[PDB]
Amino acid sequence: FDKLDPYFQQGWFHFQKSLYYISSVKNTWHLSREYCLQEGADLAIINSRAEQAFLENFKMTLWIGLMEQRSERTWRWVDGTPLTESYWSLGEPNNYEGRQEQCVEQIDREDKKGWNDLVCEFSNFYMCEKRIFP
Amino acid sequence: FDKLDPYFQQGWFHFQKSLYYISSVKNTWHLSREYCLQEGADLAIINSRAEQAFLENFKMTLWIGLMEQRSERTWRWVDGTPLTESYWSLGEPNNYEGRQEQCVEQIDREDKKGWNDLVCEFSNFYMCEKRIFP
Ligand SMILES: OC[C@H]1O[C@H](O)[C@H](O)[C@@H](O)[C@@H]1O
Ligand SMILES: OC[C@H]1O[C@H](O)[C@H](O)[C@@H](O)[C@@H]1O
Ligand SMILES: [Ca+2]
Ligand SMILES: [Ca+2]
Ligand SMILES: [Ca+2]
Ligand SMILES: [Ca+2]
C-alpha cells in the first residue's frame, strides 16, 4: 500500500503484482507507448492466460506492448522478449488487405476476441503496465 | 496480499481497499446484484471522487449498487447508506418518459457521462465490489 496508494490516487489499479492504467484518449501505437514510458512504465505485456483474460474482460479495443520485428512477421514485446504464448484472434496476424500491420491491439468484437495486428498509425485506447513486485 | 490471489485468478482486480469484478454478461439490476452477493460481495458503492473516476474510466455502461427507496426519488446504496455525494449525469435522475427508473447505471455516452436512473428490468454489464482491507 505504501507502494500502491500514490498510483491508485492517479487511477491505476492492481492485478497480480502489476499496476495497470487505461488511457482516457486514443492514440497511435507509438504515442500511446510514449505516454506509458513517461509514467515509468510501458505498454502492457501479456505473460499468462489469466492476464489475457483480465485484458479481454475490459471489452475495450486496446493497444498492447507487442510489435513486429521490421516486416519479418515475428514479434517482440516492448521489454525485448520474443513472443512465446500468443492469443491471436482467428485469422490473425494477417497484414490485412496488404497493409503494414506492425503493431498489436486487443480487439473488442462480436464473435472475434483476442489480438489483431494493425497499422501503427491508427488510434486506440491503450493500457500501460508497471511491475511493482517480482 | 496472498488473500487477493484466488480473486485475481477469477478476474477480480484491486483498487484502494476493494476488489472489483466486471461481468462478462448483461443482466437485470436484480440478477446482477444476486451474482455479486453469491461471490460474497455486492454491487459497487461509489464512496469518493477517485472511485467515481476509476468507474468512469472503464468506458462501460455498468449497473452500480444504488437504488431508489420505493418511488420516493431518494436513494440508498446496497450497503444501506443514504446517498450523499452524487455523480448524476446532466438531467438525471429523471424517470424518463414516465417509466419507473429505480435502479442506477453508470452511462458511457457522448457528451453525457455519469449516473443515470434506469428501469431495473433492463440489462447492463455490472460491477461487483468487495471490501478486503479495513
Ligand atoms: O481495420 C483493420 C482490421 O480490419 C479487420 O478487422 C481485419 O479483421 C483485421 O485483420 C484488420 O487488421
Ligand atoms: O433509455 C433510457 C434512458 O434514455 C435516455 O438516455 C435518457 O437520457 C435517460 O434518462 C433514460 O434513463
Ligand atoms: Ca504483464
Ligand atoms: Ca490484422
Ligand atoms: Ca466503494
Ligand atoms: Ca434516467
Author numbering:
A (entry chain A), B (entry chain E): 47 to 180
Could you give the paper's own sentences about this structure?
Among such receptors is macrophage-inducible C-type lectin (Mincle, gene symbol CLEC4E), a member of the C-type lectin receptor (CLR) family, which functions as an immune sensor for both pathogens and damaged self. Mincle recognizes its ligands via a calcium-dependent sugar-binding site, containing a conserved EPN (Glu-Pro-Asn) motif, and a hydrophobic groove on the carbohydrate recognition domain (CRD), which are in combination the major characteristics of Mincle. In Takifugu rubripes, one of the first vertebrates whose whole genome was completely sequenced, a protein sequence bearing the EPN motif and a hydrophobic groove was found (XP_029706534.1). Altogether, trMincle shares similar characteristics with mammalian Mincle in its amino acid sequence and its FcRγ-dependent cell surface expression.
As the structural analysis suggested that trMincle possesses a sugar-binding pocket, we set out to investigate the sugar recognition mechanism using monosaccharide glucose as a candidate for the model ligand. Indeed, the crystal structure of the trMincle CRD-glucose complex was determined at 1.8 Å resolution. As suggested by the glycerol complex, one glucose molecule interacted with the calcium ion as well as the surrounding side chains. Thus, the sugar-binding mode of trMincle was similar to the other CLRs bearing EPN motifs. Indeed, computational superposition of the boMincle-trehalose complex onto the trMincle-glucose complex demonstrated that trehalose causes a heavy steric clash with trMincle, suggesting that trehalose disaccharide cannot bind to trMincle due to the narrow pocket. It evokes the possibility that trMincle cannot recognize disaccharide-bearing glycolipids, which are typical of exogenous origin, such as mycobacterial glycolipids (e.g., TDM or trehalose monomycolate (TMM)), but instead may only bind monosaccharide-bearing glycolipids, which are often derived from self, like β-GlcCer. While mammalian Mincle recognizes both exogenous diglycosylated lipids and endogenous monoglycosylated lipids, our results imply that trMincle may function as a receptor that selectively binds ligands such as monosaccharide-bearing glycolipids. The narrow sugar-binding pocket of trMincle suggests specialized recognition for monosaccharides. This makes it difficult to recognize well-known mammalian Mincle ligands such as mycobacterial glycolipid TDM. Although trMincle may not have the ability to recognize typical mycobacterial glycolipids like mammals, it may detect fatal infection through the alteration of endogenous metabolites, such as hexosylceramides.
